[PDB]
Design a protein around this ligand. Structure first.
Ligand SMILES: Nc1ncnc2c1ncn2[C@@H]1O[C@H](COP(=O)(O)OP(=O)(O)OP(O)(O)=S)[C@@H](O)[C@H]1O
Ligand SMILES: Nc1ncnc2c1ncn2[C@@H]1O[C@H](COP(=O)(O)OP(=O)(O)OP(O)(O)=S)[C@@H](O)[C@H]1O
Lengths: 353, 11, 353
């Protein structure tokens, strides 16, 4: 009927994700443009509209994978998620790159037209990055072979996708699906990229009198360095220039903070607190939390530097002894968690009646 | 089918 | 039906395990929480529950492998074990990561639904850790590569496994087993991790008169240091931060003492001493032990630094000559072992009926 505006899409994602406004806008704009391109299928205009792929570079536990999963719940065209690690170039035991298209076909009931207008998400793209130290004498199929194979697929080429994807025999007949209009989204938490960017952007090293001295505190944060990202920096990481060229749109994510982490406990639809609160409700017990406790939990999780996943660790440790003997007790109605409980100086206050 | 559906194989 | 409580689960595990209350509590809560997630689709409210993978750290012979094997006896869902060393990156001769899910299907007679709610245990996970591979001179399929492949698998994703090893090429229909609800338990003995934790816990800002802190430290047991483990310490051991982030709950184990070994020799059902008694009972011969003998056995075991497995070596070595000729004669009703027998300066006492 009518294509939803980017604001509607962003608002929907906010129910499941917190922060990362730049990533939300880029994803919404891309989906909006993709829908518009699909609408004018006849393409009355002489010019042939060209697609623009998207790249996601953010730290671990920043919502990269969550954004793709949430988008599927709102999208109407086929959507698929793949892992670059298992991918291998053609002619090897590892699954071929064309297998990704086979997965998309299953979602659209093996419809060639639907697959051509489908969306595809890729994760672990940083893992396939080449090793500059490794000499070129040894062939790389996991990292280099995958990048070289995705060039034509991303830019748009006819792919002989197998019907089921299990095996690809040369004599066997395969379906032909064009990828000129298919959109691909690559994600990955590039480890060590900030170091390369800082070396190039700062260039403050030097012991001589003339050379400037920079304090460690003066160094920019990891998130800030990611903002000043250029294709030349990614090339040093191990990505061939051809691959990055196919990805003109680059988006970054910011590290979570204490205030932002506090919202993750209650604001998300499937937040950690909601899961634990519901887990206790099905046993005839009520659960409550305190704002002070969340602040301490978020502060401790930040030290772990593991992202949002760190929150699950803290909560499990505090409530470990509780669940070990929760159903054994009787005449219990509500459970209240105090700030001291997180610090380990007190136990949960049980409510009887 | 005792025999495989494909006799020729690919390495 | 009613789900078993953690107390009942711990009692059964306490029969075959000794001095592992901390680890037993974590495992009991996980199984209890896992069963609750199975009875209800998502929740009464409608929000899904994220799983929590367990990480077991402990020295060899501490019961890490025994816990998983014993737990399988009380599990009503498919269970399977795996070897991390065999796993390798895709496109290589080594075993593929997806084969682990294949093993789970064998237990449930190739039932995709049953496997989706199954439990999986991984052993010697420390072997895949990086060995000073931070520069990444060459890709390690056995080390860092295995971790990268497990990143998305632990989180949850579709896995393409052949139903019957690709029976026919047309209409292969590779089984798609989602692992979003499949629990994973990793276990392995870490060597050197204690020193890493000791260095972090060790105080002392500097050396010399300028130092304002004396850097006083005291000796601590291996188990005590492991309790203070944090994700930062594991990263320095050669683990990817993204990988450890998938395991929110971490459980540690302690060493054994004379009292623990002494109890293990008689308290468990399938105890070492009980096994020999049954082997002698079937031949119409009774066997008895003495407290003094167990004390020497425990001291010898901890003196050789061979763990609990060393016990068998000492027992058989003491009864070798005894059972070498036991079937020859007859009219023997009871056998008695003394402390001097273990020392090698005596011989077992035989009682004739
Ligand atoms: N903004 C957020 N809102 C809610 N949950 C979040 C958010 N950011 C991260 N998470 C949690 O972190 C996990 C998602 O991790 P992602 O950030 O998508 O993936 P990643 O860790 O960046 O790298 P990969 O691709 O998973 S190896 C889920 O458990 C989410 O609940
Ligand atoms: N508390 C215990 N009670 C009974 N047997 C035990 C106990 N702890 C260890 N064992 C014995 O130890 C063996 C099982 O090995 P584990 O204790 O799991 O050591 P491990 O961690 O498996 O070592 P690996 O080779 O690194 S997996 C069996 O022979 C058990 O009988």
């Amino acid at each position: 009927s009518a294509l939803p505006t980017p604001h509607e899409i962003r608002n929907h994602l906010d129910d499941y994700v917190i922060g990362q406004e730049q990533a939300k806008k880029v994803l919404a704009v891309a989906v909006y443009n993709h829908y518009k391109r699909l609408r004018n299928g006849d393409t009355s205009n002489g010019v042939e509209l060209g697609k623009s792929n998207i790249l996601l570079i953010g730290p671990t536990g920043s919502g990269k994978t969550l954004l793709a999963e949430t988008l599927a719940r709102l999208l109407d065209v086929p959507f698929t998620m793949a892992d670059a690690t298992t991918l291998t170039e053609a002619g090897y035991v590892g699954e071929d790159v064309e297998n990704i298209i086979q997965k998309l076909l299953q979602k659209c009931d093996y419809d060639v037209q639907k697959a051509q207008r489908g969306i595809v998400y890729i994760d672990e793209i940083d893992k396939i990055s080449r090793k500059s130290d490794n000499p070129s004498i040894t062939r790389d199929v996991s990292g280099e072979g995958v990048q070289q194979a995705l060039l034509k697929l991303i830019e748009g080429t006819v792919a002989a996708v197998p019907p089921q994807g299990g095996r690809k025999h040369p004599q066997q007949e395969f379906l032909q699906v064009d990828t000129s209009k298919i959109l691909f989204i690559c994600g990955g938490a590039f480890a060590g990229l900030d170091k390369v960017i800082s070396h190039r952007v700062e260039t403050g090293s030097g012991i001589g009198f003339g050379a400037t001295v920079k304090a460690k505190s003066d160094k920019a944060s990891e998130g800030e360095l990611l903002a000043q990202v250029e294709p030349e920096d990614l090339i040093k990481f191990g990505l061939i220039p051809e691959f990055i060229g196919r990805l003109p749109v680059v988006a970054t994510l910011n590290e979570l903070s204490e205030e932002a982490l506090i919202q993750i406990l209650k604001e998300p639809k499937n937040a950690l607190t909601k899961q634990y609160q519901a887990l206790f409700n099905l046993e005839g017990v009520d659960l409550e939390f305190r704002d002070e406790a969340l602040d301490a939990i978020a502060k401790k999780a930040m030290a772990r530097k593991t992202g949002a996943r760190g929150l699950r660790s803290i909560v499990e440790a505090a409530l470990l002894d509780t669940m070990y003997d929760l159903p054994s007790m009787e005449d219990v109605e509500k459970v209240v968690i105090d700030e001291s409980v997180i610090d380990g100086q007190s136990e949960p206050l049980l409510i009887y009646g | 089918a005792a025999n495989d559906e494909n006799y020729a194989l690919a390495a």
